[PDB]
Amino acid sequence: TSYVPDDGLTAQQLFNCGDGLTYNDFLILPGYIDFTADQVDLTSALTKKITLKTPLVSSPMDTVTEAGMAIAMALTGGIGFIHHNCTPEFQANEVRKVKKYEQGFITDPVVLSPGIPITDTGRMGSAPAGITLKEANEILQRSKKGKLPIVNEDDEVAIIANRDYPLASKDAKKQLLCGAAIGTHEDDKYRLDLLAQAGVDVVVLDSSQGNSIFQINMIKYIKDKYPNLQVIGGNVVTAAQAKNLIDAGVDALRVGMGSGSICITQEVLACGRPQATAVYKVSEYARRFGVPVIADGGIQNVGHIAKALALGASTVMMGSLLAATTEAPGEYFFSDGIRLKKYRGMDKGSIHKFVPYLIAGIQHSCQDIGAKSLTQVRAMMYSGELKFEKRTSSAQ
Amino acid sequence: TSYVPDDGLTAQQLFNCGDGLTYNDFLILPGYIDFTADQVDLTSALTKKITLKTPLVSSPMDTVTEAGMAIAMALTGGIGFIHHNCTPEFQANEVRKVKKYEQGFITDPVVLSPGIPITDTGRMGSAPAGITLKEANEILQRSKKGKLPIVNEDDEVAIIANRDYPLASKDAKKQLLCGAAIGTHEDDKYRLDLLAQAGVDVVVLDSSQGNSIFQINMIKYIKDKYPNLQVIGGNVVTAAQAKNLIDAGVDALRVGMGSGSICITQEVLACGRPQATAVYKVSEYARRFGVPVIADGGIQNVGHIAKALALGASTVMMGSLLAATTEAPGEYFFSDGIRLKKYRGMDKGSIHKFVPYLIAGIQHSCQDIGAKSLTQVRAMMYSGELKFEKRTSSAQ
Amino acid sequence: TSYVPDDGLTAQQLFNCGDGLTYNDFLILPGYIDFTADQVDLTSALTKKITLKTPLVSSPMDTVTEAGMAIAMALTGGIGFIHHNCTPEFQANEVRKVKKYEQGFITDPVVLSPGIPITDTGRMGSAPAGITLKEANEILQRSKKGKLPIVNEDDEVAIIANRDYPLASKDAKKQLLCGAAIGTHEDDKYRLDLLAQAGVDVVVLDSSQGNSIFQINMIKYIKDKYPNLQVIGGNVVTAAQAKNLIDAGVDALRVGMGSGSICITQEVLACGRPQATAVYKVSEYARRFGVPVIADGGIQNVGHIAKALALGASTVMMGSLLAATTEAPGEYFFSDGIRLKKYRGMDKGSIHKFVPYLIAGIQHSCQDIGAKSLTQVRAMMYSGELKFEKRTSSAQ
Amino acid sequence: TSYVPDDGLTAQQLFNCGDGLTYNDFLILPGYIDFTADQVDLTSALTKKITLKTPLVSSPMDTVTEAGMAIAMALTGGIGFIHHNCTPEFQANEVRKVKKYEQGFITDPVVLSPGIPITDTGRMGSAPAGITLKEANEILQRSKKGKLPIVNEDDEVAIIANRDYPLASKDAKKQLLCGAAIGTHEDDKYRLDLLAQAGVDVVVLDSSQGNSIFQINMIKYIKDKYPNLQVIGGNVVTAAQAKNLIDAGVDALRVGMGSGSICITQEVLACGRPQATAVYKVSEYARRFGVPVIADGGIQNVGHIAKALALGASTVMMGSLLAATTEAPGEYFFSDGIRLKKYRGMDKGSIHKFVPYLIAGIQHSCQDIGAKSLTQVRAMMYSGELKFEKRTSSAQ
Ligand SMILES: NC(=O)c1ccc[n+]([C@@H]2O[C@H](COP(=O)([O-])OP(=O)(O)OC[C@H]3O[C@@H](n4cnc5c(N)ncnc54)[C@H](O)[C@@H]3O)[C@@H](O)[C@H]2O)c1
Ligand SMILES: NC(=O)c1ccc[n+]([C@@H]2O[C@H](COP(=O)([O-])OP(=O)(O)OC[C@H]3O[C@@H](n4cnc5c(N)ncnc54)[C@H](O)[C@@H]3O)[C@@H](O)[C@H]2O)c1
Ligand SMILES: NC(=O)c1ccc[n+]([C@@H]2O[C@H](COP(=O)([O-])OP(=O)(O)OC[C@H]3O[C@@H](n4cnc5c(N)ncnc54)[C@H](O)[C@@H]3O)[C@@H](O)[C@H]2O)c1
Ligand SMILES: NC(=O)c1ccc[n+]([C@@H]2O[C@H](COP(=O)([O-])OP(=O)(O)OC[C@H]3O[C@@H](n4cnc5c(N)ncnc54)[C@H](O)[C@@H]3O)[C@@H](O)[C@H]2O)c1
Secondary structure, eight states: OOOOOOOSBOHHHHHSSSOOOOTTSEEEOOOOBOSOGGGOBOOEESSSSOEESSOEEEOOOTTTOSHHHHHHHHHTTOOOEEOOOSOHHHHHHHHHHHHHOOTTSBOSOOSSOOOOOOSOSSSOOOOBTTOOHHHHHHHHHHTTSSOOOOBOTTOOOOBOOOOOOTTOOBOTTSOBOOEEEEOSSTHHHHHHHHHHHHTOSEEEEOOSSOOBHHHHHHHHHHHHHOTTOEEEEEEEOSHHHHHHHHHHTOSEEEEOSSOSOOOSSOTTSSOOOOTTHHHHHHHHHHGGGTOOEEEESOOOSHHHHHHHHHTTOSEEEESHHHHTSTTSSOOOOOSSSOOOOOOOOOOOOOHHHHHHHHHHHHHHHHHHTTOSBHHHHHHHHHHTOSOEEEOOTTTO | OOOOOOOSBOHHHHHSSSOOOOTTSEEEOOOOBOSOGGGOBOOEESSSSOEESSOEEEOOOTTTOSHHHHHHHHHTTOOOEEOOOSOHHHHHHHHHHHHHOOTTSBOSOOSSOOOOOOSOSSSOOOOBTTOOHHHHHHHHHHTTSSOOOOBOTTOOOOBOOOOOOTTOOBOTTSOBOOEEEEOSSTHHHHHHHHHHHHTOSEEEEOOSSOOBHHHHHHHHHHHHHOTTOEEEEEEEOSHHHHHHHHHHTOSEEEEOSSOSOOOSSOTTSSOOOOTTHHHHHHHHHHGGGTOOEEEESOOOSHHHHHHHHHTTOSEEEESHHHHTSTTSSOOOOOSSSOOOOOOOOOOOOOHHHHHHHHHHHHHHHHHHTTOSBHHHHHHHHHHTOSOEEEOOTTTO | OOOOOOOSBOHHHHHSSSOOOOTTSEEEOOOOBOSOGGGOBOOEESSSSOEESSOEEEOOOTTTOSHHHHHHHHHTTOOOEEOOOSOHHHHHHHHHHHHHOOTTSBOSOOSSOOOOOOSOSSSOOOOBTTOOHHHHHHHHHHTTSSOOOOBOTTOOOOBOOOOOOTTOOBOTTSOBOOEEEEOSSTHHHHHHHHHHHHTOSEEEEOOSSOOBHHHHHHHHHHHHHOTTOEEEEEEEOSHHHHHHHHHHTOSEEEEOSSOSOOOSSOTTSSOOOOTTHHHHHHHHHHGGGTOOEEEESOOOSHHHHHHHHHTTOSEEEESHHHHTSTTSSOOOOOSSSOOOOOOOOOOOOOHHHHHHHHHHHHHHHHHHTTOSBHHHHHHHHHHTOSOEEEOOTTTO | OOOOOOOSBOHHHHHSSSOOOOTTSEEEOOOOBOSOGGGOBOOEESSSSOEESSOEEEOOOTTTOSHHHHHHHHHTTOOOEEOOOSOHHHHHHHHHHHHHOOTTSBOSOOSSOOOOOOSOSSSOOOOBTTOOHHHHHHHHHHTTSSOOOOBOTTOOOOBOOOOOOTTOOBOTTSOBOOEEEEOSSTHHHHHHHHHHHHTOSEEEEOOSSOOBHHHHHHHHHHHHHOTTOEEEEEEEOSHHHHHHHHHHTOSEEEEOSSOSOOOSSOTTSSOOOOTTHHHHHHHHHHGGGTOOEEEESOOOSHHHHHHHHHTTOSEEEESHHHHTSTTSSOOOOOSSSOOOOOOOOOOOOOHHHHHHHHHHHHHHHHHHTTOSBHHHHHHHHHHTOSOEEEOOTTTO
């Protein structure tokens, strides 16, 4: 015969009709493999102009992402978003700590509470620039002590006493990219400014319902005042929502609502769509304007991610799934028996182990379906080459 | 493009076809926000002639509503229903305690078991009326003691020794509205009478199956004998049921069956429809006659309420969800660890904190969908502007 | 308007199409009440010729029904089925103990291990017959002892030392009806005979798959040899199955498979249909020949029963649901805390409290839908007057 | 009437349309029995040329199958697959231990760590061949010791000091069949060779996604180099997958993915179809080329097996379900209370009790539906004579 029937449904005929499907309600029928997983290119687009080596993005949650988390996240091919549950000052400070982080040089010396190296952030208190970490790394040995204060040719930078990150994510001026979330109220315009000044690359307008006149004007504002800053619009779950925000000027959309971790109020309130039908719906529209979508919320394993990207998502934001990694802010562990952490509002190794592990699964995931890039995975579903199968309740 | 497709299903095409949907089987896709939540008007109709500032209503359950509960409930914008698991006398007494409650004046002085202020409910045993609480509140100071017996200009009323309730619910004669449930047996006609005399504003005919010749005649009776009393018909779940009761004369319908808390017998018996398809179905009919519907049963969070009202409900009755508030009758707490209360038949702060909190969520709920009033939320669904999405088992 | 739409689905359009519905997958929309529950006539047909006052029937399980259970069961309006996990002799003995039980007279005197009243089952060892229990009940007083051996006018019956059962179930010769289950192997023909001789009214051919050449011939056999004995055919779940058995001669069908309690092997094996689609399907066919159906298995509450009968069932068999009653054979209780009993193979008051309680719920169940008899409930569904509503997984 | 309607759906109309059904989402409506279960012929085809008496096959898991397990498995009518989590040498050794096992003769004497019988695997260190176990079994008695070293007529085989297996599975040269799994990497070609030399009958290419250029070439290779060796292709779940592998030359397909036990990575990853829709789909295609399918994964009880075979499967592979049997490799038991075993990666009696028990249920399963052979069960479903019924979530 050599004919072989036909299987699965096309993403459309499956996600565009009275569904309400979550990541666990379907699977993706496998294809033909003819290459190894390592060749699976994960290059993803965070925003129109910003692009990462991997599609991983950590959440602006007070328990997930902070200066530490963001840095590792960028070095490992992703990006982090500094939350905003702290005075604008301390947050914009966290951005700097990251935007300044040069692989090697100790950042955040100890002047006076934000051992003490006395001085005035460039005023010799107590090392020629342009030198390679090697030169000084040895110089310290003869210094018969440890560190070594660096500075310009006029006694006016920082200190320092297998570190390769081939995929890390820097900006034009070779610096780890960093983002942060803000609100849409007035007070945020200041906060934003401080952040802008601290060197932030992208600002995501943090909100449960981003389709408000408030988020709109906030977009237009930023888009105008700061033409060199990518803005990510409030949380949406439909195209009717994405439209405005896209017209207001967003450079990416953050999809998700009634998914992931809750804080207070009502995560499952009146409104709260399944994170698959949403990602599919919203992306399908967003792509029409070249606006990427971040699948924010509801990721528990690598599989979820593959599925997230396969439906139209360019990147995927995770919170909890990352919280257990060490680079997450906190302390309230019990080593006697089991897992319990604390989350507050208004185990799992270094991210340098975790992220590499995710990328493996994601590449492997793209391999099983015969795809060699997150882009060929998306092209395959919009074409119908990629076939899905729905799973029953009892089934699951 | 600027076109943007179409999403969700209209409430009809979703609730009028072999469904059997509960509050958790669907969500409500969000709209466009362009105003703040506080502007969300919750004015709701309890009955044809009675109207509250909020849509909240507490249940005639021996563990949920009693004189205390009702009072707070009315002051905070709702209304309570005194249960009827007590001799007609003690119940009709509870009504008075509420209908008499004047913000300030101590009610239910201690004559002789229903410190003692001796007298004869107006016969000087042991204060000029028309006086403002301030006048006497000071007078007591000079009285060098505490209280102060008040009375008419003929030595023949009561005593007294940020209290603002802008939204409280009073009747023409400025008094906290109060309701109570009764049965449809003979003995209830007396009970009813006592209640009528105690000043009750609405009487809800308590019953699992309200479409009986018994409830009908009971309606007609009351409607006749007491032309100034709003009657709420037995529990229904279809339009065929609501019809009779509406024709018998009801001024509101109480929808619900096989939902919420159980007592004895069979809550899930042969008959017991999902509280969403029912609220939708019954309301759709009731509105045709100007008869409001109380969505009674199955409310666990604010979300449920928004969904309840969005489907056609004018008000929502809660029992358990309120039981933990302090104004609920009881005592059997354990402060060592967790929740356990007792319910008997034939934690959570003051209601002045809870109700305000519900109203917040409900207003917020109306905000997310772009509605500015519970009425514009209903108008939007009957029009199809409001769009829903069904959720799978596995999904949920 | 006074029109009122249309609701629910007819039993057919709901149970005759790719369903596989269990008792919990649907509910029964309520009707109009215009009479009290006590007027709800539960007269049901166990077999073509045998008819009970109630539709209750206890299972031939070694832990549910035995001489004790059967007796109470018959007195309270039902019937029991003595299991067959004991030599044919002891089982056929249990039948007699029941077929002999006369309200008042002590049965099973103590001759010599099957205080001792010496004799030879009618041979004066150590009272005029036709006497009323009153006569002798007093006679014993003057006898200055206790009991009183009775006998024929030739010194050759039994002894004896608010008992009204208006609904009990007797045969022509005024004796509590009693049934028992047997197998279809050879050895059973003897067993059967002994039973036949002991006075059994109906024999149910105990089997997981009753549509076998074995059960068929076993039917034909009994039907022939004993023309005055009602036979209940092996367990079935389709009409194709019921046909043969009906043609072989059965006088009732026992529907059920992959439901209720398990013993060994595979209750949920390859084959094992939902007990609702089955009861509906099989009954629909059985009724065509005047052959009643016993809904055997899967009953946890009164509701289940109403639903069972409403779909076409004439009677309902229960096992576990009755096991906790006292009349059930056993002992392995712990009064310190909770429920645990033992079931072995190859709390809850007297049945005089339980059965009356079931009948209440069943009558009440028939009331809610507006039916006055189990027969008018069935007539209403086959007509479509009775309307059902399916319930989702997440719903349930 | 004597007509009797129509029930169930044909396997196609049920498994070839947006389903995603697992073994528990449906049941198989019973037929007509007219023969005893013991007459139910279970002869099944493992591969084109290899055929067993039963359809049972144990998994190549480091915790399920090893030399011991395989032997019993073959003797009881099945076959085992030696896993490959050990150097090629120790694995190929396990094959020999099995391919050599002659019912009676002690195998694997103790020369020197792979009491000691000194020698050189045939070089007299320290019995005429062709002798019956009886001859020597007695000879040992006069030997006044125990064992007895056997050898050729030139002092150059083995030793030895109700054993009937009517259904055991041997090859042409009367030896227990044995198989083993290998990978598709280079290193496996050696491993394979050693195995080939050890006498293995079938090699299953162990892989999560068997439709790779790697598995293909690996097939072609083996098929060529070893024309007398049956090859079982990587794990598949569609026909598009099976095609290649079949064209590459496989002699059987191993169906399954996202089912059973997990090890590491993502069992439920992007891809992972329900083991029923898959078995149905893949078999339907495979049978077109005479290529049998092993339903690998997701078996918890006999029922599952019957269902597995009924949908198109020729054999069924089990892992966990067998792990608890004694012939499974291991030790980490607690006899104080309950079940816990250990599974590691890169109770339940002898299999001589278990396998016989499975065969019973499987025969019984075929009986209930009226089938007398696993083949007539398959022929009945492809014809539509065999009818299925879907089960709801809530149902299940
Ligand atoms: N990070 C996320 O993606 C996400 C998702 C869900 C909930 N949340 C959190 O839950 C909290 C409460 O719910 P939310 O998300 O709707 O809060 P939000 O920050 O989106 O704003 C809440 C409401 O206040 C009003 N508002 C906002 N800015 C205003 C302004 N400048 N002037 C006047 N009114 C203004 C709007 O009605 C808005 O709905 C948020 O503060 C947010 O931190 C965040
Ligand atoms: N509050 C509610 O909305 C609600 C809901 C479900 C159950 N329940 C409680 O469960 C209890 C038992 O079930 P119910 O709700 O059907 O009880 P009910 O009060 O509605 O009456 C029970 C039955 O008694 C009969 N009856 C009622 N009044 C009669 C009269 N005057 N004369 C003759 N017969 C009369 C009717 O057959 C009626 O179905 C009720 O008493 C009620 O308190 C209440
Ligand atoms: N009581 C019930 O309704 C019910 C339901 C499910 C299982 N069971 C119990 O499970 C046990 C095992 O399964 P089952 O119900 O199929 O058992 P069964 O009593 O129906 O007989 C089992 C098998 O033995 C064969 N057989 C029966 N009588 C025979 C005869 N006279 N000559 C030759 N062969 C004969 C038939 O193949 C039959 O399928 C049964 O003994 C029964 O007690 C009972
Ligand atoms: N036994 C089963 O049926 C089964 C099912 C699921 C998972 N697993 C286990 O999970 C492990 C990891 O996942 P997997 O099943 O995809 O592993 P695998 O053995 O199928 O190979 C993994 C990947 O390595 C590459 N590869 C394989 N052979 C190669 C070669 N010769 N040259 C270059 N590249 C090659 C391919 O991309 C392949 O997808 C496997 O090793 C397997 O043991 C087994």
